[PDB]
Amino acid sequence: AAKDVKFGADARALMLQGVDLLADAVAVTMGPKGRTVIIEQSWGSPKVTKDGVTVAKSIDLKDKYKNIGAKLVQDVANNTNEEAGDGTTTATVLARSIAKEGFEKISKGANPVEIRRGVMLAVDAVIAELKKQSKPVTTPEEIAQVATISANGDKEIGNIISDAMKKVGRKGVITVKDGKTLNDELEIIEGMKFDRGYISPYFINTSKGQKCEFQDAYVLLSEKKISSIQSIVPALEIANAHRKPLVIIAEDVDGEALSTLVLNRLKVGLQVVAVKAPGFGDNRKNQLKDMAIATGGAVFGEEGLTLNLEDVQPHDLGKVGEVIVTKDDAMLLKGKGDKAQIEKRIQEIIEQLDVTTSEYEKEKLNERLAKLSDGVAVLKVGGTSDVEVNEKKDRVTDALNATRAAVEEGIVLGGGCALLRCIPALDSLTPANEDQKIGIEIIKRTLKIPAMTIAKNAGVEGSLIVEKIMQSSSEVGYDAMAGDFVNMVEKGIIDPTKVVRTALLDAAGVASLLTTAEVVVTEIP
Amino acid sequence: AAKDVKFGADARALMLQGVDLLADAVAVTMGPKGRTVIIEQSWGSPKVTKDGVTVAKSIDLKDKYKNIGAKLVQDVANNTNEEAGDGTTTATVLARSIAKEGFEKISKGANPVEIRRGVMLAVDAVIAELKKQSKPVTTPEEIAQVATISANGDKEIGNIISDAMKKVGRKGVITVKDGKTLNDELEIIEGMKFDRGYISPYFINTSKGQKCEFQDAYVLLSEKKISSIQSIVPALEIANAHRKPLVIIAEDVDGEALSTLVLNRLKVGLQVVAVKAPGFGDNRKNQLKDMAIATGGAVFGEEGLTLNLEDVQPHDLGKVGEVIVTKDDAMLLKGKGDKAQIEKRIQEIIEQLDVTTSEYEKEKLNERLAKLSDGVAVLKVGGTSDVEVNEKKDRVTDALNATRAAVEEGIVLGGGCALLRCIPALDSLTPANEDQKIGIEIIKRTLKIPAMTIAKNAGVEGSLIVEKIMQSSSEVGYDAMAGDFVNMVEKGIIDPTKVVRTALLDAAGVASLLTTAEVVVTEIP
Amino acid sequence: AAKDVKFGADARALMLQGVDLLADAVAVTMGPKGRTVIIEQSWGSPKVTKDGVTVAKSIDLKDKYKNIGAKLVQDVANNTNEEAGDGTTTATVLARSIAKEGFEKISKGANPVEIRRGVMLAVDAVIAELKKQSKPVTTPEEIAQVATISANGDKEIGNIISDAMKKVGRKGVITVKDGKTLNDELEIIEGMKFDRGYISPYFINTSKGQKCEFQDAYVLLSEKKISSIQSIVPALEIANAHRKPLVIIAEDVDGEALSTLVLNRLKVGLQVVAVKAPGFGDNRKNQLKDMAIATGGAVFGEEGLTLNLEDVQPHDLGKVGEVIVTKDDAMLLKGKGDKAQIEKRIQEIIEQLDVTTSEYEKEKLNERLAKLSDGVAVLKVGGTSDVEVNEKKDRVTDALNATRAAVEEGIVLGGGCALLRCIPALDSLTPANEDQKIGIEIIKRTLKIPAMTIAKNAGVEGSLIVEKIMQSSSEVGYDAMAGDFVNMVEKGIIDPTKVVRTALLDAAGVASLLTTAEVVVTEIP
């Protein structure tokens, strides 16, 4: 495979020319006044959209170096911001602006590593300032306010969100479902969730949204890894006898099992899904034991009690009402089993919390406790018809992910004004040398970019708006919807702090990586 | 898949150059004096035609951006106006005119969003004026007048249309059939219709017209969705034993059932069709219960009474005389079952209407009531031979769809004069700024376009006609057929108001979407 | 499928340049002095010919627009004149001349629709004049004269033609056959003919002439359509047991039956042919009943008497001596069955004619009567050897079709002089405006075209001949064979009036359609 190689500024120029296409195509769709972008798909109608992540995930350039620039911006600013579809555009625009500004200085004689150090210093100072001028959200009234704000004034949606949240706590688990009724209602049910996603992207069922959904499946628990281990088909025997699905939880899946399952799901699509074990080490073992207690099954490891995957009985497996598994996330609903032995295990974990003393110990114990003592709250959204319910479910999920992101680290002024308020923090910072001072001036400039872009999307003169917002009060900002200055928190122009912080971090990281890369090696066409 | 990306005016120019080809190819065939368009099909004779929707659905450009412009105009102005073949051309021409006029101003410095706001304001004012200067149709005499007018003076066709309509009411159901006789006659028969179309476009039988027709089929009712559920073939067993067809009604069809049915219909074409459930939620369940009562079958859900798709008996399914299903529309004819239990269910729904009180409740109850208490009227058109009957059936369907569209929202002056009479309404409107004033001048101009185009198609000087019609009386207009001014309602130059309103709405929407699009991303060849 | 689109004069120019190639290639072979045209077929010798329809059906241009022009002229001037091979060339030449003349005026500022109206007025006046100056043929002496004239003086052929005609009447049925003898002789035999052609072009047997011939076949009668209905193979069982063929008459054939029959005829060629039902409605049913009475079979509809296609007995089907079926035409010969019940059915139809009173009723009754009471006359042509008989059969068919066309609407002066005599009728016509006057001058010119072309083919100066024929007597014309003026009816330069009328009608229609077409959309190569 013959390769081509370019060096220094010669390759950085091409990477930047590839970046500023994605940046321009995404910066259009920022803010509430975001315009539309026509994306031609081959067979059907050209898809119109106003959503930054779709535009970003779409484009793919022809030239090799431009494509690697675009892909470098994408696979971080997008892949690292899967929580909400709001921070990705900000990340890409900040990244392009930092990179383009720094390329000028390093082409005019500055030292790249010094600029990267200065930029990292500035970004640390700005994140520090953010963590100060933020304000938390810890009372159900404020929770209702922020929820309703995120749902665009829907008092009912914000109300039901706060009701679920204050019922299952801040660290609880929340899910949305379609209640087949006219009115939305909140329900709490038996279930448990852990943070291990699906292993096979071919497992995708109910494809839209990249999910994997199955009903009343059987549950398998295996401490021993089933990597390159056939004889999984004994379980499939009873899983075909009883048409109910089955789920398997192994230390890992590889070789025989992996290759057979991917292909048979591709061609038959049998109702089984594989997921990695949730915990680690002894905590993993005790977690699988708790899950077996909660599902009515048993671990399929040979240690202790004798049981193998070579044979299966209907009472050996576990049973639950529903299961949902997606990227990095998986959950189980309405588990079967010994309801009295579940309480016995709860008491066991209580006495464990009583006896153990270390931070890690009691932490993992609280995790295992909450994973069984507290149920999940399902939001049964409803409406007149599925054409309404399918859209309201998406709005509810958006508002839910917004408020969950807000409760973690508070909220700040929306509309990109937050970064504007953090500019005076750069004054106190002192550079070690003049290159590290240019590394501060760069952030000084690039912090005003999201506000300028939202203003320009609203059709208004950007710099005129940003200079006035800068000199104005600390609590007032620009509302692109109404086109005039307003008290943001009062009006509701807010956004979670985690989003701004993550966006700025990823932007700085990618821009550094892209302005210090010295050698680019690409295939030859 | 390498993509290409263009920005702003540079892409809008190409999209507009792609639009004005479809607009020119369709504007020719407008009015009664519409010319002809030679469409070469590959194998046979070049098809001559004077029908706007065929010309529109035909063309498909070479360049990518021109093609997306043409497709943007098509997939709305056509797909949204499937009711009658008259509004689509008007929609496309209005869209092109608005877009071309606005592109000039936004190339001369105006703000796109402001123009779109002004245009939306003007369109709202014009639709308001239409809803005023319209006049309803609510008496059988006026119904006969408008029917005969739509059928081009055929007193017999309009008479039979009004007879069917006043017999089954305004909201009744009407169908046309071939009576195998010399004289057309009206018949009312047992049946029911709901608004869920076919799921598989491969189901098309009696292909011309995109329909699906079957006789004396069996009826299946399944509240449980059969998505990715095999064992549908038990029913197919008895459906092959008795050569009579079968229809299935499920919450949904997917996976196993979908993939098997599409392919076996492609290669064998077995006499079964799948359709989505008609209602929603509890209303869906009660609707399926009423349909089972009306057909002699039973719901195949496991709840309550035990019954599965794994086994079928001839008396488990429903039975009807005929079934027709098309896009968004499906109906059943001459259902079997307990004629006494049908009356019992009718009394049940009557007492339900008595007890329940909410608007939604009594609305759905009236729907379920009328879906069983009132039969459908079938129009048995007849003639000397099928070469006449096949054409008369199409004329009758056209007149029927025209009068049904007229009874909903009244009628207005035909020949595009209606929009001309709505021009003085734009005087009272006031703009917030000068861009929103150009957004009014644009509609001021584009409202005169359909009349100008019909006049030009008649070979007459357009502006000369439109200025005289503007200054003339409110009730007089231009008759391109006779080539002179005439009292329209008196002569019969009319058209339903719904058509003009929908055409103007879709035109404004598409023109806005096309004059504000900022980024176009297309595949590379 | 990317398309290309041209507008107005720009596309009409290309269509006309495509037309004037077919027109020139066919105008050569007009008249008796028609020259020859070398048509290269790929494998064998280049086929020489002097026949206009073969030259026309042959050519097929390269460019798309030229090809659609040529195909537009072809698929009407040919497809509408399948009766005799004489009118097609005249139609194409008149069409080209009108179109080329009108393109000049519409390129010099005239209104196309006005010209089309004027041209239609002129053509109506000319057809009126023709219907006046024609003269009928209603006596056996005149029949013999016109027959002998059409057969180029063959007294024997004209004599036998008149003998058959005056024996079976003007509306009788006549067929030609090869008598295997030295002398031609006339025979009348049992049979019946109806006007429904073959359904499958793959049915072609005895391929030359596009016919379908079979001997002593079985006859099937099915009122119920066999569209998408298998189990036709029960009949094929006995149709293979007895090697005699079978014919089926269904309301329609589609799906299962169509797809199986086309392919098995392609690969096996079993001796069965399918034809559409002859009549319509109740008349269709009574016609099938009469045909069953006449053939010894029975209708295979389930109504009344029980009988299905699922089973067949040798006495259920009908039986006839011979059957011939071609495009739009099908006939049966020497039917079997109850010769006494046939007379009983005849008496039934007689009493029906007695009781019924409406025009349509007695008309259909006379049709059903004559279809059984009167036999067909077969012309057994003969000669020394098949090399002579095969050519004499074609000459006899030509003369027969000529005299049958003459008896319908009389005869006129041959050699294109008829249209010349109709020129003075255009004087009385008055135009509404000057464009409709150019629409008269165009026909004034184009009427002299066939005579000019025949003269030029004879090598003589055309205009010199046409001016002298114009000023000469009403009964004298030009004989290109002898090259001098002669009394046409006396010499025998005649042609049926139907041919001239149809040619002029089709020419005017195509020329209008081609000079008013505004948009041409063609595939891109």
Biggest interchain interface, per-side counts: A-B, 31 and 33 residues
Report the total helices of chain A. 20
Shape of chain A: globular
Query: Biggest β-sheet of chain A, characterized?
Result: 7 strands, mixed
Percent of residues in helices of chain A: 40-55%
Cα(first) to Cα(last) distance of chain A is: 10 Å
| Strand coverage percent of chain A | 15-25%
What Rg of chain A is obtained from the alpha carbons, in whole angstroms?
A: 26 Å
Integer tally of domains of chain A: 3
Strand tally of chain A is 20
Q: What does this 3D model show about the protein?
A:
In chain A, α3 runs antiparallel to α20 and α4 (87-107) packs antiparallel against α16 (434-446). Chain A has helices at residues 9-27, 52-58, 64-77, 87-107, 112-133, 140-150, 155-168, 233-241, 255-267, 281-295, 339-355, 359-373, 386-409, 417-421, 425-428, 434-446, 449-457, 462-471, 488-491, 497-516, and strands spanning 3-7, 37-39, 47-49, 174-178, 185-189, 191-194, 211-215, 218-222, 226-227, 246-250, 253-254, 272-276, 318-326, 329-335, 376-381, 411-413, 476-479, 484-487, 494-496, 519-523. Chain A folds into three domains: 1-134 and 411-525, no CATH class; 135-190 and 373-410, no CATH class; 191-372, no CATH class. The longest helix of chain A is centred in the C-terminal third of the chain and has 24 residues, at 386-409. Chain A is 51% helix and 17% strand. With 525 residues, chain A is α+β, with helices and mostly antiparallel strands. Chains in contact: A-B, B-C. The A-B interface holds A 21, 24-25, 28, 33, 35-40, 42, 45-46, 48, 55, 58-62, 180-182, 269, 382, 384-386, 458-459 and B 1-5, 7, 11, 15, 64, 68, 71-72, 75, 111-114, 228, 255, 280-282, 360, 513, 516-524. Chains A, B, C: This is 60 kDa heat shock protein, mitochondrial. Chains A, B, C: The modification N6-malonyllysine is found at residue 108. Chains A, B, C: It comes from Homo sapiens.
